[PDB]
Each structure stands twice: as structure tokens, then as C-alpha cells.
Structure 1
């Protein structure tokens, strides 16, 4: 848990709002989720999304097997009722007696945004924010939230797969790139407000389907695991946005979320969903094969790996700064480092 501890300071998606509403017939939850190997429960208490450890203080039953009752989450075993702060406010067996001081469960940051539920396990450094999705509140764009997809691969390896262009000719030859353009350009990369920003111009006139988001690629990557990709498409001259983020469920699993938005929206959502699913099915077996799950020091990079080289370097900086404490981590995350000629 040691090398991963710094990840607890970020906001991570754990489920869609849809999944929470479908979990229990009340539409309020509770829903069991797992984040960085922590077993948590999510529920809607009044107007608030809450996240607690999925473990009752009394006899350790799972609260995720319980029931929302107005402004309370009720344990299924002996009916202890927890408020939005994780504090027990009713012990039905002793309704007069004072409630023990220890009758509380851990309560974590939990917020809805973009149709996903986000949890931050450690808020002590008070310097991380929910990742940036550029299409939110853009009335020009129709937004579709896909169903989550689970991979037997880590969030770091998934991020590197999503931002890697040298693999398109070998993994996506029918679908995203010609098999003949295996040589990608080396682009400037900027750190700004805790995001990696970089821009690409993919090759034109490739034998790829019209629904393929191929064009001018503008990445805004909220560290550590979210990618916002704005595509000015060549084929249609219209904006298409991909927002992909991985939930690090445990040491070898990710629950992954894709939200996409498009300016030309008279067509079928399922044209795009089927295409995204095909791309993911092409990536999945190769990424799941990578072993060990966490990239060892012995991996051999080439110059075309600039994006993942720079990604790994920043992650190591954040892990090092975490050991040094709050101010060092804030600096490592939010200090600007500009390579390009743009102004922010």
C-alpha cells in the first residue's frame, strides 16, 4: 500500500449516477464500491451523495446491504442509523441510552460531476480537484455516458495505452490508423494546473471509418488518470470530445469510464458507442497481458515514447513529493512547466 498511498489524495470516479440509482429499488443506493482496495458504500441521503467505509461500527456488517431512510443510512443487522457525517444517531436496541462515542464510521469526500460519482479518500493536502471535462455545459454538444468497462490492468497502464499513438497501426489497423503510419511525431508537453496539455495533428486521408474520431487532437489530462481529448475531425469538420478516466479498484483491476460529446449529433449514439467498444476490444487483450501489472524499472523506452516517459516522470515526482508533505505535493502538482509556445 506504500507506493500507492499518494493516489488517495486525488478524486477518483467509482460509479455512474445511473449505477447508483439502479443498485437499489429506492434509487438512493446503497451501492458497494471499491477504490484503492478500500471497501466503501455510496448512498444519496437527502440532497447529498455520501461515501462511508462499508463496515458498521457495531458488529462489522456491510452497510451496503442496508437501506436509506431519509437522512440516514441504516445497517441491515441491528438497524443502527448513520448520518451524513458517518455518526450513529440511533441505536434501536437502546433508544434511551447515550450512543457510544466510538459509534462512528469513516466518512469520505463524495461528489457528483458529469454524471459520475467521485470519491477522494484523503483530503489532507487540500489541493486536488475533480478532473476537467471540456464538453460539460457546452450547449453545442450532445453528451453520452457509456457503461463502465472493467479491465485486468492498472490505471497507469490504461492511461499510457490511451495516449500512445505508436500502437494504432498494430492494434487498431482497421479502425483508427493506417497500418503504414507507425512513426508518430514528438510533441511539446506542458504542465499547467495539474494537467498535462499537448496537441497532435494525426495523419490525413487514412482508410478509417467516418465515425472514427480522427483529426487535430488536443489533450488536457488531469493527473493522474483522466484524459480529455478534443478532436477537430478531418472527415466532418466538427468537434468530438472523449473523456476517459480509470478507477484504480485494486492493484490489478480498473473500472473505466468513457464519456463522449459531439457537435454533429443528428446521427445515432450507437454508431459511436459501437465504435468505441470495438477500439476497446482491440486494446483489451494486449493491455491485460502486460506483466508485471506495474511497470518495472527495466522497461526499455524509445524516443517515440515521450508522452509515457513524461507521465512516469511526473508520477514519480508526485510520489516523492507526497513523502515530503502537503506543500511539496502542491508544488509538484500545480507548478507550471511549459514546453510549447502557448499562453495559459
Structure 2
């Protein structure tokens, strides 16, 4: 249902690498996944992470109950095998007949990065990249990948909560609220290279549109820096599979000191954000000046929506044209 069609051009994370390896005893998958209400299967065929529609072209069985055979995905029902382009190469019942030309299942751009598996459902605008994680490569940093966490909220609403400042005092009094710096500021926001960028005082955001946040917290550079990377998988209209990867300089402490803390603040948000109805933000919400980030976010998604209808070039401009508001130089 096509108010969300523009979302198909972006790269979305569907599972962790370790979720795929855990899925089937072979460690190759297949793993079933759902993205923007599409039912897909992921599997490692050879050296490629391949993503096809989880529906076989023959009698419509789910390839995710199949098995990986060599470099192919084998349907569990009558054993057809599919190659990295989703084409059937073996029909065991008539191995000497021709393979019908329609014996084919849709395939989607599937690439690994940062420890997660990303899928891009519609490549026809050739102008979106996998979101940016600042801490990959940086060898001073230890990187932990938390289990995915699922919310009954939309990627847009989850996004907005992660970049929200006004809510600390009420949802996170014990864990995030700084009573001396109690009231949030207004900050300039830049569009650059498909990302939103803004800073605090020091927290620095690089939000690859639509659903990814890259938050670099430094302790006025004195101590040492901490990076949060949080991206929402729009599973369906009501649901998100949410991924948090975090990196830290100070690696001497326990990973589960941080994992529990993150876990805690997410548990504080979840019941509120899930309560918001209607699940998608209607046009009768009343804002005030602290909501700059949420408004600017919605402004740009609307433009990306309209730009999409106009077509490829319009969308490329909408996404990548810079819109600088601050003094920082690019």
C-alpha cells in the first residue's frame, strides 16, 4: 500500500550476521525476513549474501524452509534450485527437460556491512547508499552488536524518539536526565549527502535518511568517545525490528555494563512509544519550538515522498542536495 513506496529505494537492515548463521544448522541460512511487508529469504550462496522473495515459482512453497545446496537455494518441496540471480538451474523431476523461462523468483540487492545484512528492494534510482556508521574501521574502538529489539511502533516514530531531547526528564529521570542542563536547545541542522547533521553541548548526530542515527558522544574530548548507531527496520506498517551497534574507546570495562544500560533506557521508552496512536503521525499534532528536529525530519520525508513521485532525478536531488544552516564548512 503505496504511501510507503519511496521507502523501497533505501537500504534497510533485516537481520544481524549472527542471526543468519544461527537460523539453520548449516550456518548458511536460509533465514526468513520481512521488510516493508515483503516476505523475503536471505541465504549465503557462495561468497554472496543473496536475498530473494520467500516464495518459490513452482508451487509457491517458502524457500526459507529449504536448504542451501552448494551455491544455490533448494526449495524444500520438490527440490528446485535457485542461483544468485534467482533463476532455476535444476528441476530434479525432469533433469533432462528444458527449464521454463518463468522458473524464476525475484532477487534483491543484498549486502553485508557493520555486522548486519542490508536489502534494497528497488535499485532503479541508483542513488542510495547503506547508512553511515562513524566507528567502523577506527581501530581505537571496541564495537558491540546488540541483539535486535522489536517495538510495536513505526520506524519514523522510533527515529524521532531516539533524537528527542524534551523527554529525558520524564521517561529517563534515573538514567539520562541531566538536571542542571534540564532544558533542550534549538540547534542548526544541515542536510549533507543524504544525512541530517546537528550537535549539542558534546553530542554529534549523523542521521542517514530515513531511519539511521549515528551518535558520537565525546566527553569534551578530554576523556574518550562513545558511538551509538541505531537503525530501524520498517517490518510492516505497525512494527520495527531495531538494531543498535555501539562502539567505545574505553574497552577495559564489561560489554554487559553498557548492554544493560542501553537495554534499560530502551525499556523505559518502549511502552510510551508503542502507545502513540495513530501509529503514523497525523496532521493534527501540535508542536512547540523544542520540536525543531522532529518537524525538520518530517519536512524532508515529505519532500522525499513527493520527489519520488516526480521520478529518479527529482529524488536524487531531494536526497543529496545540501541544505546548510550552520557555520560548519563542507
**TM-score, normalised with respect to structure 2:** 0.98
Asked whether the 8 Å contact 1:169–1:181 carries over to 2, the reply is no
Asked whether the 8 Å contact 1:169–1:180 carries over to 2, the reply is no
Q: Can you list the C-alpha shifts for 1:221-262, whole angstroms capped at 9, x where unaligned?
A: 000000000000269721100000000000000000000000
Q: Can you list the C-alpha shifts for 1:11-61, whole angstroms capped at 9, x where unaligned?
A: 000000000000000000000000000000000000000000000000000
Task: Label 1:31 to 1:246 Cα distance change in 2 as closer, same or farther (>3 A).
Answer: same
Q: CA deviation at 1:127?
A: 0.2
Does the residue aligned with 2:200 lie in a helix, a strand or coil? strand
Q: Can you list the C-alpha shifts for 1:278-310, whole angstroms capped at 9, x where unaligned?
A: 000000000000000000000001000000000
Distance of 2:245 and 2:86 partners within structure 1: 31
Q: Can you list the C-alpha shifts for 1:102-153, whole angstroms capped at 9, x where unaligned?
A: 1000000000000000000000000000000000000000000000000000
The number of residue pairs the alignment matches comes to 330
Q: CA deviation at 1:180?
A: 6.5
- Counterpart of 1:137 in structure 2 is 137
Q: Can you list the C-alpha shifts for 1:143-172, whole angstroms capped at 9, x where unaligned?
A: 000000000000000000000000001100
Asked whether the 8 Å contact 1:160–1:308 carries over to 2, the reply is yes
Task: Label 1:270 to 1:236 Cα distance change in 2 as closer, same or farther (>3 A).
Answer: farther
Asked whether the 8 Å contact 1:168–1:179 carries over to 2, the reply is no
Q: CA deviation at 1:179?
A: 5.2
Asked whether the 8 Å contact 1:23–1:29 carries over to 2, the reply is yes
- Counterpart of 2:208 in structure 1 is 222
User: Unaligned regions of 5+ residues in structure 1, if any?
Assistant: 203-216
Does the residue aligned with 1:287 lie in a helix, a strand or coil? helix
Task: Label 1:236 to 1:265 Cα distance change in 2 as closer, same or farther (>3 A).
Answer: farther
Task: Label 1:245 to 1:264 Cα distance change in 2 as closer, same or farther (>3 A).
Answer: same
Task: Label 1:290 to 1:179 Cα distance change in 2 as closer, same or farther (>3 A).
Answer: farther
Distance of 1:235 and 1:295 partners within structure 2: 37
Of residues 309-318 and 231-240 in structure 1, the stretch that sits farther from structure 2 once superposed is 231-240
Task: Label 1:236 to 1:152 Cα distance change in 2 as closer, same or farther (>3 A).
Answer: farther
Distance of 1:297 and 1:160 partners within structure 2: 16
Distance of 1:172 and 1:236 partners within structure 2: 26
Q: CA deviation at 1:343?
A: 1.0
User: Unaligned regions of 5+ residues in structure 2, if any?
Assistant: none
Distance of 1:286 and 1:73 partners within structure 2: 42
State the superposition RMSD in angstroms.
1.1
Of residues 217-226 and 233-242 in structure 1, the stretch that sits farther from structure 2 once superposed is 233-242
Q: CA deviation at 1:183?
A: 1.9
Distance of 1:337 and 1:163 partners within structure 2: 19
Distance of 1:245 and 1:336 partners within structure 2: 22
- Counterpart of 1:40 in structure 2 is 40
- Counterpart of 2:246 in structure 1 is 260
Asked whether the 8 Å contact 1:194–1:222 carries over to 2, the reply is yes
- Counterpart of 2:228 in structure 1 is 242
- Counterpart of 1:210 in structure 2 is none
Asked whether the 8 Å contact 1:145–1:260 carries over to 2, the reply is yes
Q: CA deviation at 1:181?
A: 4.7
Task: Label 1:182 to 1:292 Cα distance change in 2 as closer, same or farther (>3 A).
Answer: farther
Does the residue aligned with 1:230 lie in a helix, a strand or coil? strand
Distance of 1:321 and 1:158 partners within structure 2: 23
Distance of 2:129 and 2:50 partners within structure 1: 17
